[PDB]
Ligand binder design. Structure first.
Ligand SMILES: *[C@@H]1O[C@H](CO)[C@@H](O)[C@H](O)[C@H]1NC(C)=O
Ligand SMILES: *[C@@H]1O[C@H](CO)[C@@H](O)[C@H](O)[C@H]1NC(C)=O
Ligand SMILES: *[C@@H]1O[C@H](CO)[C@@H](O)[C@H](O)[C@H]1NC(C)=O
Ligand SMILES: *[C@@H]1O[C@H](CO)[C@@H](O)[C@H](O)[C@H]1NC(C)=O
Ligand SMILES: *[C@@H]1O[C@H](CO)[C@@H](O)[C@H](O)[C@H]1NC(C)=O
Ligand SMILES: *[C@@H]1O[C@H](CO)[C@@H](O)[C@H](O)[C@H]1NC(C)=O
Ligand SMILES: *[C@@H]1O[C@H](CO)[C@@H](O)[C@H](O)[C@H]1NC(C)=O
Ligand SMILES: *[C@@H]1O[C@H](CO)[C@@H](O)[C@H](O)[C@H]1NC(C)=O
Ligand SMILES: *[C@@H]1O[C@H](CO)[C@@H](O)[C@H](O)[C@H]1NC(C)=O
Ligand SMILES: *[C@@H]1O[C@H](CO)[C@@H](O)[C@H](O)[C@H]1NC(C)=O
Ligand SMILES: *[C@@H]1O[C@H](CO)[C@@H](O)[C@H](O)[C@H]1NC(C)=O
Ligand SMILES: *[C@@H]1O[C@H](CO)[C@@H](O)[C@H](O)[C@H]1NC(C)=O
Ligand code: NA
Ligand code: NA
Ligand code: NA
Lengths: 335, 208, 224
C-alpha cells in the first residue's frame, strides 16, 4: 500500500553532450540519460485520487525550467527595479527537447488512464511508471505548442470551470500547424501562417465543448489588456522572441491562409520573475520554426449585462502550460 | 442571480437577525458586513465557515438553494448592511437597523388619486399612505381593476418617530396617462401584524 | 499583514474620466489576483473586474467593457483603475480587494479604505408640486390626511415645510427616491382634524435651491 507523498523528482532526457544548443547543454548536466525501455505496469481493481491543480510535480517543473532559462539565455542587459546588470550578448541556439520526470528510490508515479479524465477526481484505470512521457518545456502564451493531444475529442480542463478567475485549458485532438518565419526591409517583422479552414473548424469544435458548461452562443475575442507577452501569442523561435498578433485567430461568434503579423523584440518582460531583459538584434538569414498547436489557454468574461459567453486567449502563469502536460500524473511514497 | 431578503430588519441589541440569500447557481457563498462609513468585512465564507476574529454569534447555514446568516446576540457593532456574494455576484443587501421596542400599532391607510393638475401632463401618480404603525414590517400591494401590479410602484419609509416610535410609509404607483385611462378601479392592499384582516383603500377613476 | 492602501476621494463632472490607485503591502504582489468593487448606497455592490499583476491580465465586468481600464506598476506594487465617460450613476465608493488566500479570489478578506468618487452634474430642474388631497369621506372619523407630491426634480435636495413652519406636529416628509428618468421624487403628508378642512388652509412650501425654485401649493379638499 502507499500514501500520497511529496518528494523531489529527477529528470531524464536524451540530450547530446557534443551539442551546443542550450536545452541539450542543461539536460546534459542537470539530467540523467533516458532509459530506452520505460516500464509501465497496469494495476487491477485499483482507484486513486488525482488533482493536477494541487500537484507538486507542477511546481517542480516550473522551478527547473526557470533554472534552464536562467542558465541558458544571455541578455545584454538585465533590468530589475533600479540599476541593471550588463553582460556579453552572444547569440544562442534554442530548441527545446523532451524532459521526462522520474521517481527516485522509494517512490513511484501513477498515471491516470481514464479516457475522459479532467485533471481532478477518481481514476479507475490506473497504471504505474517510473518516468513521465517526454515533455518539451515550451514556454508560450495563448497557444500551447508541441504538446500532447486529446485522444478522441477536444478536452476542456479547469481548476473550477465556473470560476471566471481560473484559466481554462483546452486540449486539441487534431493539431493545427502554425508556421512562423522572418524572410531574409524591417528586420523585426515576421509572420505566422495557419490554415484558415482548419483553424475555423477547430474553433467550432471548441465551441461545442464549451457548451456543456454553457449552453449558449460562444464568442471568441481579443485579450482585454495586459503585457504584450499576454496579449500576443509569444514564444521563442531559435533564440529570438516572437510576438504575434492573434486578432484573426480569436474573433468569431458561434451559435486561404490566416496570416499573423509578428514583431521580434529585443526587450522583453521576464516570465521567470519580475524584471525585463534586453537582447541583441535578430540573427540575419532565414529565421523559421513551425509548430503543432495542441492547446489553447482561455479566460471567460465575468459580469451579466444568457445570451452569450465570451472567451479571450490567456496565459502568463506558465504553470498552466506544465499542468496541461502533467495532469495525468501523481507521485506517491511506497510504505 | 442572487436574491437577498428581507430588505430591512428592525431589531434591538440582544435580538437575533436572520438574513437569507437565494441562489440557483453553483458556487461557494460568503457574507459581508458593512458598518456606516467603513469598508465591508468578510464574515462567513464557504457557506458556514467563520472568518478570523468573528464570534460564534455569527453563523451561516444552507438549505437547498437558500443560504442563511444568523446573528444571535445582537450588539451595536453588528448593525449595518449585510451582503451575500457568490463569485463576482452580490445580493442587494439587507439593512439591519436599530429599532425601539413598542406596543403594536396598526397603520391608518389613505389613498390619494392623481391631482388634475398632473393628469394634464401625461403622467398619473397614485399614492398610498400607511401612517404611524409598528413594527416596521408592512406589505403594500397595488391592484388596478383588481389585477396585481409589478414594477410600477416605489416605496419610501420614514425613520422611527422620536416621539411615538411609529413608522410611516408611502407607496406610489406611477402610470402613464394612457394606462390610467384604460382602468377604473385603483386600490392598495395593506397587511400588517396589527391588522385583524388585510385592509384595502380604493377608488374609481374620475369619481371621488 | 496584508494591507491595501487607496488614494483620496474625488469630485468629478459628467464626461470626465478618473484614475484611482491602490498600493499593496505585506505579500507577494505578483502572486495574488486583485479586484475592483464599487459600492453605492441602495445599489447592489458591483464587481468591476480583476487584475493579475503577474502579466497584467484582466477580466472586466461585461457592463463596463470599453469604459474601464485596470493597470499596475509592478515595481511599485500599485494597482490602478481608470473609468472614463463618467455619469452621475458612477457616484460610489470604490474599493480594491484581495482574497483570503491566493488560491481563491472571491473570499475578500482584505479591503482598502475605499476611494469615494462623486460625479456632480451642472444640470438642475425644479419639481412639479401636486396636491395630495383629502377626499374619500372626511378621511375618517376625525383624522384627515393630505400632502404634496414633489415630483421630477434634480439634483437633491428639496425643503418642505407646512404653512411656513406653523404646522409641524403630525408631519411626515419621506426620503426622496430616484426614478428611471434620473429625476427624484418625494412625498410629504400631514394628518389634521377632518372637521377643520373647511376652515383651515393648508399650504406646502417646497424649496429646491439648485434651481432656486419656490413653490407654495395650497392643498384643498374635494368639495363635490
Ligand atoms: C475486482 O473486483 C470486482 C468486483 O468488484 C471483480 O469482478 C473482479 O474479479 C475483481 N478482480 C480480482 C479478482 O482481483
Ligand atoms: C472534472 O472536471 C469538470 C469540469 O470539466 C468538473 O466539473 C468535475 O467536477 C470534474 N469531475 C470529477 C470531479 O470527477
Ligand atoms: C485502461 O486504459 C487503457 C487505454 O488507456 C485500456 O486499454 C484498458 O482497457 C483500460 N483498463 C480499464 C481499467 O478499463
Ligand atoms: C505535428 O503533428 C504530427 C502529427 O499529426 C506529428 O507527427 C509531428 O511530429 C508534429 N510536429 C511537431 C513539431 O511536434
Ligand atoms: C472547485 O471549487 C470547489 C468549491 O466551489 C471545490 O470543492 C473543488 O475542490 C474545486 N475543484 C478542485 C477539486 O480543484
Ligand atoms: C467556419 O465554420 C462555420 C461552420 O462550421 C461556417 O459557418 C463559416 O463560414 C466558417 N468560416 C470560414 C471563414 O470558413
Ligand atoms: C441547449 O439549448 C438549446 C436551445 O436553447 C437546445 O437546442 C439544446 O438541446 C440544449 N442542449 C442541451 C443538451 O442541453
Ligand atoms: C493586434 O492587431 C489588431 C488588428 O488586427 C489590433 O486591433 C490590436 O490592437 C493588436 N493588438 C496587439 C496585441 O498588437
Ligand atoms: C472580427 O470578426 C468579424 C467577424 O466575426 C469581422 O467582421 C471583423 O473584421 C473582425 N475584426 C477584426 C479585428 O479583424
Ligand atoms: C487548409 O486545409 C484544407 C484541408 O483541411 C484544404 O482544403 C485547404 O487547401 C487548406 N488551405 C490552404 C490555403 O492550404
Ligand atoms: C515545435 O517543434 C518543432 C520541431 O522540433 C520545432 O522546430 C519548433 O521550434 C517547436 N516550437 C517551439 C515553439 O518550440
Ligand atoms: C451576444 O452578445 C453580443 C454583443 O456582445 C451580440 O453581438 C451577439 O449577437 C449575442 N449573441 C447572441 C447569439 O445573442
Ligand atoms: Na547544436
Ligand atoms: Na549575458
Ligand atoms: Na464565491
Amino acid at each position: 500500500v502507499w500514501k500520497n507523498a511529496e518528494t523531489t523528482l529527477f529528470c531524464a532526457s536524451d540530450a547530446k553532450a557534443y551539442k551546443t544548443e542550450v536545452h541539450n547543454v542543461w539536460a546534459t548536466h542537470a539530467c540523467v540519460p533516458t532509459d530506452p525501455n520505460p516500464q509501465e505496469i497496469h494495476l487491477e481493481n485499483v482507484t486513486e485520487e488525482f488533482n493536477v491543480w494541487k500537484n507538486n510535480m507542477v511546481e517542480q517543473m516550473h522551478t527547473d525550467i526557470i533554472s534552464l532559462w536562467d542558465q541558458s539565455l544571455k541578455p545584454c542587459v538585465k533590468l530589475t527595479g533600479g540599476s541593471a546588470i550588463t553582460q556579453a550578448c552572444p547569440k544562442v541556439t534554442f530548441e527545446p527537447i523532451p524532459i521526462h520526470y522520474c521517481a527516485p528510490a522509494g517512490f513511484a508515479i501513477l498515471k491516470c488512464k481514464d479516457e475522459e479524465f479532467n485533471g481532478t477526481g477518481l481514476c479507475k484505470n490506473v497504471s504505474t511508471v517510473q518516468c513521465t512521457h517526454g515533455i518539451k518545456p515550451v514556454v508560450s502564451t495563448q497557444l500551447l505548442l508541441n504538446g500532447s493531444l486529446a485522444e478522441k475529442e477536444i478536452r476542456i480542463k479547469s481548476e473550477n470551470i465556473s470560476d471566471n478567475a481560473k484559466t481554462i485549458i483546452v486540449q486539441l485532438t487534431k493539431p493545427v500547424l502554425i508556421n512562423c518565419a522572418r524572410p531574409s526591409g524591417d528586420i523585426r517583422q515576421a509572420y505566422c501562417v495557419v490554415n484558415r479552414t482548419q483553424w475555423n473548424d477547430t474553433l467550432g469544435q471548441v465551441a461545442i465543448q464549451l457548451r456543456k458548461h454553457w449552453n449558449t452562443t460562444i464568442i471568441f475575442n481579443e485579450p482585454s489588456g495586459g503585457d504584450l507577452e499576454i496579449t500576443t501569442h509569444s514564444f521563442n523561435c531559435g533564440g529570438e522572441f516572437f510576438y504575434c498578433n492573434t486578432s484573426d485567430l480569436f474573433n468569431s461568434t458561434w451559435n486561404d491562409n490566416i496570416t499573423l503579423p509578428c514583431r521580434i523584440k529585443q526587450i522583453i518582460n521576464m516570465w521567470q520573475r519580475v524584471g525585463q531583459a534586453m537582447y541583441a538584434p535578430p540573427i540575419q538569414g532565414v529565421i523559421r520554426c513551425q509548430s503543432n498547436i495542441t492547446g489553447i489557454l482561455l479566460t471567460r468574461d465575468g459580469g451579466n449585462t444568457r445570451t452569450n459567453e465570451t472567451f479571450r486567449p490567456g496565459g502568463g502563469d506558465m504553470r498552466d502550460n506544465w499542468r496541461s502536460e502533467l495532469y495525468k500524473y501523481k507521485v506517491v511514497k511506497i510504505e | 442571480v442572487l436574491t437577498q431578503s428581507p430588505g430591512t430588519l428592525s431589531l434591538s441589541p440582544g435580538e437575533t437577525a436572520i438574513i437569507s440569500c437565494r441562489t440557483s447557481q453553483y458556487g461557494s457563498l460568503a457574507w459581508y458586513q458593512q458598518r456606516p462609513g467603513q469598508a465591508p468585512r468578510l464574515v462567513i465564507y464557504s457557506g458556514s465557515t467563520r472568518a478570523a476574529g468573528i464570534p460564534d454569534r455569527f453563523s451561516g447555514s444552507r438549505w437547498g438553494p437558500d443560504y442563511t446568516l444568523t446573528i444571535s446576540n445582537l450588539e451595536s457593532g453588528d448593525f449595518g448592511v449585510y451582503y451575500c456574494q457568490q463569485y463576482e455576484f452580490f445580493g442587494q443587501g439587507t439593512k439591519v437597523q436599530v429599532d425601539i421596542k413598542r406596543t403594536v400599532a396598526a397603520p391608518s391607510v389613505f389613498i390619494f388619486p392623481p391631482s388634475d393638475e398632473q393628469l394634464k401632463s401625461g403622467t398619473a401618480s397614485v399614492v398610498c399612505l400607511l401612517n404611524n404603525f409598528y413594527p416596521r414590517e408592512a406589505k403594500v400591494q397595488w391592484k388596478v381593476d383588481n389585477a396585481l401590479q409589478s414594477g410600477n410602484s416605489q416605496e419610501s419609509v420614514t425613520e422611527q418617530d422620536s416621539k411615538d416610535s411609529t413608522y410611516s410609509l408611502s407607496s406610489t404607483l406611477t402610470l402613464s396617462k394612457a394606462d390610467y385611462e384604460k382602468h377604473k378601479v385603483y386600490a392598495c392592499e395593506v397587511t400588517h401584524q396589527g391588522l385583524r384582516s388585510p385592509v384595502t383603500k380604493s377608488f374609481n377613476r374620475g369619481e371621488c | 499583514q496584508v494591507q491595501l492602501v487607496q488614494s483620496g476621494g474625488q469630485m468629478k463632472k459628467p464626461g470626465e474620466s478618473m484614475r484611482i490607485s491602490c498600493r499593496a503591502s505585506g505579500y507577494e504582489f505578483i502572486d495574488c489576483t486583485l479586484n475592483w468593487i464599487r459600492l453605492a448606497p441602495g445599489k447592489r455592490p458591483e464587481w468591476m473586474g480583476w487584475l493579475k499583476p503577474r502579466g497584467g491580465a484582466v477580466n472586466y465586468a461585461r457592463p463596463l467593457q470599453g469604459r474601464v481600464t485596470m493597470t499596475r506598476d509592478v515595481y511599485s506594487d500599485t494597482a490602478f483603475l481608470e473609468l472614463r465617460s463618467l455619469t452621475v450613476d458612477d457616484t460610489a465608493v470604490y474599493f480594491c480587494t484581495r482574497g483570503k488566500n491566493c488560491d481563491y479570489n472571491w473570499d475578500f478578506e482584505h479591503w482598502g479604505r475605499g476611494t469615494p468618487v462623486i460625479v456632480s452634474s451642472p444640470s438642475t430642474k425644479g419639481p412639479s408640486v401636486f396636491p395630495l388631497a383629502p377626499s374619500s369621506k372626511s378621511t375618517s372619523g376625525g383624522t384627515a390626511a393630505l400632502g404634496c407630491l414633489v415630483k421630477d426634480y434634480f439634483p437633491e435636495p428639496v425643503t418642505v415645510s407646512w404653512n411656513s413652519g406653523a404646522l409641524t406636529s403630525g408631519v411626515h416628509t419621506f426620503p426622496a427616491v430616484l426614478q428611471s428618468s434620473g429625476l427624484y421624487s418625494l412625498s410629504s403628508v400631514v394628518t389634521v382634524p377632518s372637521s377643520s378642512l373647511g376652515t383651515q388652509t393648508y399650504i406646502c412650501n417646497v424649496n429646491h435651491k439648485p434651481s432656486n425654485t419656490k413653490v407654495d401649493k395650497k392643498v384643498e379638499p374635494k368639495s363635490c
